[PDB]
Every structure is written in C-alpha cells, then in structure tokens.
Amino acid sequence: MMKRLVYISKISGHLSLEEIQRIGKVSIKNNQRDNITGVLLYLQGLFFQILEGENEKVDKLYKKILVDDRHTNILCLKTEYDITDRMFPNWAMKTINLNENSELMIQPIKSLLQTITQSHRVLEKYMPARVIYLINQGINPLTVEPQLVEKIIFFSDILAFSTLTEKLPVNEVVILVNRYFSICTRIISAYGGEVTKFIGDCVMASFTKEQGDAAIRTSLDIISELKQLRHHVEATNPLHLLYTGIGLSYGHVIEGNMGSSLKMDHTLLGDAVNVAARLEALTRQLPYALAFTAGVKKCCQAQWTFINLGAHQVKEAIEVYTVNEAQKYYDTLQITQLIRQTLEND
Amino acid sequence: MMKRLVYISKISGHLSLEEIQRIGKVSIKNNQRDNITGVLLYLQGLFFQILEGENEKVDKLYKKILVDDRHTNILCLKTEYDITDRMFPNWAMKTINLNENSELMIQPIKSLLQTITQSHRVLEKYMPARVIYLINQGINPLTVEPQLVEKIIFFSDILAFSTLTEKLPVNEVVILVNRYFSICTRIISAYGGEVTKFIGDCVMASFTKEQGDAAIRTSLDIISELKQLRHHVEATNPLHLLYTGIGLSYGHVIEGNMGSSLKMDHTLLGDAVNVAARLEALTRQLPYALAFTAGVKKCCQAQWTFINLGAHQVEAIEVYTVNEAQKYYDTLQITQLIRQTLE
Ligand SMILES: Cc1cc2nc3c(=O)[nH]c(=O)nc-3n(C[C@H](O)[C@H](O)[C@H](O)COP(=O)(O)O)c2cc1C
Ligand SMILES: Cc1cc2nc3c(=O)[nH]c(=O)nc-3n(C[C@H](O)[C@H](O)[C@H](O)COP(=O)(O)O)c2cc1C
Ligand SMILES: [Cl-]
Ligand SMILES: [Cl-]
Ligand SMILES: [Cl-]
Ligand SMILES: [Cl-]
Ligand SMILES: [Cl-]
Ligand SMILES: [Cl-]
Ligand SMILES: [Mg+2]
C-alpha cells in the first residue's frame, strides 16, 4: 500500500543553490532505493514537497526530513492513504526552483501560490494548537466529530491587570501582554500542552491526563520566568510589575467544532473550564500563585509537596490544592498596592 | 496612483463554462475602458483574481464584484498600494482554466496551489471575524497596532450548563450549544455587534457606544428566541431546558492582535470585560435575565424602563436592568427543574 503526503516549510536562513542541489541528488539516490517519488519546489524562502511511496518508506523519510537543520516551521498539509496511482512516477525527486522561472504564462500561478502560502502561514498562527495538530496528522479538522475527553484545563492571567490598564499607555500595555503571552505559550508548548485561546489577558490551555506533572512544571516555570524578568528590567519598565496567578482543573470536557455558519470555533465545554478559571481568580486570596483541584493532584506522579487549601465554592464546594514550590515570597495585597504606587505619578 | 489586489472566492453552483466565458468578455471590455489589468483563474470550484489599476477604478470594480452572485465567500488576501509597475500590463482580464491544463511540468504547481488554497479555506473558518476584516481591508494583522476603543461588552451563557453537561450525552450537548451559539451569533450580528469568541458555553461580543439600544435589543431578542424555542420542541428535547443570562458593561478596551510568532489571537483588554462577565453571573441571583452598568444605561436613548438593582460587589457598583428583562420564572426553581427533568 502507498501513501502521498504534502508539506510546507520555512527555509532556514539563506540557503545556497548548491546546497539545494545537495538535497536533490541525495533525495534522488535515496528515493530510488526506497521507490519514493515526488517533487520539491521552493519559492521566496519556502519549501513545498510532495512525497509518495509505500507507507513505511514514506514515514521513515518524513521522520528524517522533520529533523533536518535546513528548514523549520514544518507543516504537513495533506496525507492521502491507499493511493492508486503515483502522481510523479518518473521523478525520484524533481527539484523546481520557482524563483528562477520567468515565463509569462506561469507568473499568475506563481504569484497566487506565493500570496496564498504566505497568507496561510499567517493564519496558522491564529489556530488553536489542536487544529494544527489535526492538520499535521492528515485529518480535516472541520469533519472531526466532537469527543468527551479527559483534560487538565490551564488558566493563567496577570495580577492587578486592571491597575496596569488604568495607569499605562496602550502601547506599553500591549508590549507587556505580548511578552506575557509569548512566555506562557512557549513554555506550555514545550511541555506538550495545547494553547486554546487568549481571553483578555488570560491564557487558556489544556494538557492530557498523562501530563499532570508537566502542567504543574509549566505553571512553576511561568512563575519562575516572570520572577526572573522582573529583576532583569529597569524600574521604569512595566515588565518590572508582571506577576501571574494560575489555576488548573481536571475533568471531562467536550472538544471539537462548535458554532454555526456565521462563526465556528474549536471549543472546550465542561465544568473543568469554569473551575480552572475560578481557581485562577482565587490565587489572589491565597499565599500561593498556583491553585488546582484534587483531580489534578491525582494526575501527578512526581513527589510534589501537596498542600491542602481547604474547600472553596465555585459559582458543592471543591477541595483546592497547591504545591509548596508555588508559595509567594510576597504578600499579594502589598504587591497590588506597590503596582499602583509605582504607576502613580502624583 | 495605482493599487493591486488579489482575492479568492468560491464558484457558485451551476456555473457553466459559457457563463465564465461571458464574465471574461465583459471584464475585458470594462477593464480596457477603466485601464484595469489582471488575471482570473479558476480551479476545482474556486476563483482567483488579481486586479490592478488606479485606486478609485479598482475600488469601484471590486465593490461591484463583491455583490456578484456568481461567487461567494470572497476573501481579499492582499492589497498592494502605490505599485509602480503592473504585473500584467497587456491583459485587460486574462481568464485561465487551470482545470484544463494537463502539462506535466505545470501539474506540481497546480497541485500545490489547490492543496494550499483548500487548506487556507479551512483555516479561514476558525479565524476571528475581526482578523478576517483586517485582511480584507489590506491591513497586516501581525503589525497593525492595537487601539484603545470605547465598547459595550456583551457576555451571555447557558443557565445550569453544568447540570446539562453532567446529564446529557455528548452529541446532545453539542447540538444544544450549537443551537445556542447560532441564535446568539445571528442576533448579535443582525444588530451590528461583533462576536468576539466562545469560551465554554459563554458568548462574548462587543458593540460600539452608539449601539447601546442595539445591545439591549439583542439581549431581549436572544431571551425571546430561547423562550420561543423551549415551547417549540418536545419535553424530551434538551432545548426545552435552555435559558440564558446576559451581562453588559461599558468601558475602554484595548482591541487588537496579540501574542507571538508561536500563537496569535484577537483580544479585548480591559476592566469592562470582567465586569460584563460578573454581571452575567449575577443574573442567576436576580429576578431579571439581563444586568448592566450605569455606563451602558448612558449609551441608550430609547425609552426603556430602567430598573435600579442596588449596589453590588463584583468597591460596589450600581447594577441596572430593564423592565422587559424580568423573569417570568423563579431561577432556583428552574435549575432544580432542569436537574429533575434530566433524572
Ligand atoms: C526540504 C527538504 C527535502 C528533503 N527531501 C528529501 C527526500 O525527498 N529524500 C531524502 O532521502 N532526503 C531528503 N531530504 C534530506 C534528509 O533530511 C536527509 O538529509 C537525507 O535523507 C540524508 O540523511 P542521512 O545522511 O542521515 O542518510 C530533504 C531535506 C530537506 C531540507
Ligand atoms: C469572479 C468574478 C470576477 C469578475 N471580474 C470582473 C472584472 O475584472 N471586470 C469587470 O468589469 N467585471 C468583472 N466581473 C463581473 C462584475 O461583477 C459585473 O458582473 C460586470 O462588471 C457587469 O456589471 P454591470 O451590472 O455594471 O454591467 C467579475 C465577476 C466574477 C464573478
Ligand atoms: Cl527561496
Ligand atoms: Cl514570584
Ligand atoms: Cl512542591
Ligand atoms: Cl448557571
Ligand atoms: Cl424567558
Ligand atoms: Cl423596559
Ligand atoms: Mg488579570
């Protein structure tokens, strides 16, 4: 049985024509051995490749391509399974430099391909991570049926954000929120979590039930990086005032497409979403910057020092936990007052 | 001064090759007259068009193309301003049927164009409407600066949704939330509001300060349509149990594109967002399904019967409603009825 995959990628740095030639000859040699055929196109710093052959041979090759140093931001766009006919039966690997094609009748198609691909790469950034995952796996996200899944829900947001927005100019708030989002997204994604959306200054993400310790480590790493950042910058930098609170919950959530023709999105539905947001808010009243449910605790295997913060009610009460490592070295009320007083000019 | 634009669209059904030819014939005549050049391509049910010429000539033509019933789901991908040279100076409008091209050396580029565009159209379905607007207006959403704007913030969600999710099968929950979202989104959009996002079962939207009355009307209309729905369906249908609460607030919010190269989103930043969400939760404790701030009230000019609900801690703020938002039911009895109905 044969398959065919298509992917796009960003060429790492500036790549010479001779090293692009060094991809072609090795590809031709290996693909002839593996009975692989396909085409490699490049255009304005982007690679396009189509690979076809028996499934095991194609998957082995794509695993190696994925770790190749010469390109990055790799997104597989389409996978066709159990294909009847090869698309390029005579090309072990045909390389086409679309930049060098100056023919007048191909310029329209070449222009459209560059415009649509560059637009595609922008849109990719706005997708929930789950959608990018499904596309990478060759699954059309629009046709996926919703599933009840077990997830750890993550919410983190900015301490005293109302004071920051009240006292800072808009451009300074934007720099600060972008930095916060950049840090959260990088760390969540490094631990295998999936960012779902930004809501105001809040980052929403999920982890699997096998990722309880990764979820805690994510949260502590966020807190740790913010603490580092506050003493890295000057006192006139609003980043000097950036703190977070984090809530985690665990439960059954429905994951999938929701909405209508007018607006559709990837959503997560279930009690755990509300609980994680409420625990995120509760950290304001706690001497800890991370709060989570008993269910999150049961998903952890590491030797955390779990601390029981008692039962709290969520708009029936739920046990709230934290870890000793999440303890605040500051008093939260004193810090929100310091933030306001730091931003006071009078 | 000249501009160049590129858009993609979905060919409307039943569009034959003779009709596409007539499009080319008229385009050539009009574009020659207006000194417009470009190319029209089609492939597997999609149009691609590049248009270039003087700003006003191009804009007037594009406004016409926007209302042409021979295509739908039009997205202007890119606008180049102050172009120096035309890309197709000799083609008033060259029509290219990519479906008919069988040349072997073109097949790779044709295949990739179809793959990437179809994937692009999937991604578009998940994009924030505000980002799709910016792209259509030729604005780079990754570089355009967020702005401080005055907005009415709208928050609604489903009453006792925890009980619904606890007691219903997945496919039934999905049908129910989709219906709720479809109703909210259609009404908000009909009144000129902008749905921002879905957060769980919650709908977040915004209106301008000139849209105070429209925000109240939207809210009452959603409540009204849910009431209609509950007595349209049978008692075994979970939609029979669908109620909403709505909060509105007014304030300054930063609106824009935020994040990093790893993940972007469109967001509204400001205290008004939290206030609207807390007033939405407060309706559970109120004999009204709509609650809003003094600031919202000041944005209204219609002759509502405003009702003061006293100061509430969300310093406490004055909460208001309108007489029409009164609940004909007792909220705690409804939540107990939802629990009991699903037993
Ligand atoms: C864009 C791109 C496309 C590539 N395509 C192929 C290919 O089709 N076949 C292949 O064998 N190697 C291809 N490679 C290179 C592989 O990643 C790898 O360098 C090559 O298989 C040699 O691996 P080896 O020295 O460990 O055996 C490609 C690399 C890049 C950057
Ligand atoms: C995909 C598509 C592309 C079109 N491109 C052009 C064009 O480039 N120039 C043009 O005059 N009309 C174009 N039209 C048709 C116009 O929308 C309109 O039907 C035509 O200009 C006649 O308009 P009229 O009612 O003012 O006579 C296009 C229509 C479609 C569906
Ligand atoms: Cl290149
Ligand atoms: Cl800290
Ligand atoms: Cl610990
Ligand atoms: Cl509720
Ligand atoms: Cl009602
Ligand atoms: Cl009234
Ligand atoms: Mg905050």
mmCIF file of C-alpha atoms and ligand atoms in Angstrom, chain A residues 157-158 161 201 284, ligand 9:
data_model
loop_
_atom_site.group_PDB
_atom_site.id
_atom_site.type_symbol
_atom_site.label_atom_id
_atom_site.label_comp_id
_atom_site.label_asym_id
_atom_site.label_seq_id
_atom_site.Cartn_x
_atom_site.Cartn_y
_atom_site.Cartn_z
ATOM 1 C CA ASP A 157 -3.626 35.737 33.886
ATOM 2 C CA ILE A 158 -1.927 38.920 35.002
ATOM 3 C CA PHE A 161 -4.178 43.845 35.299
ATOM 4 C CA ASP A 201 -5.026 38.915 29.494
ATOM 5 C CA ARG A 284 -5.420 36.459 44.579
HETATM 6 MG MG MG C 9 -5.953 39.735 35.375
#
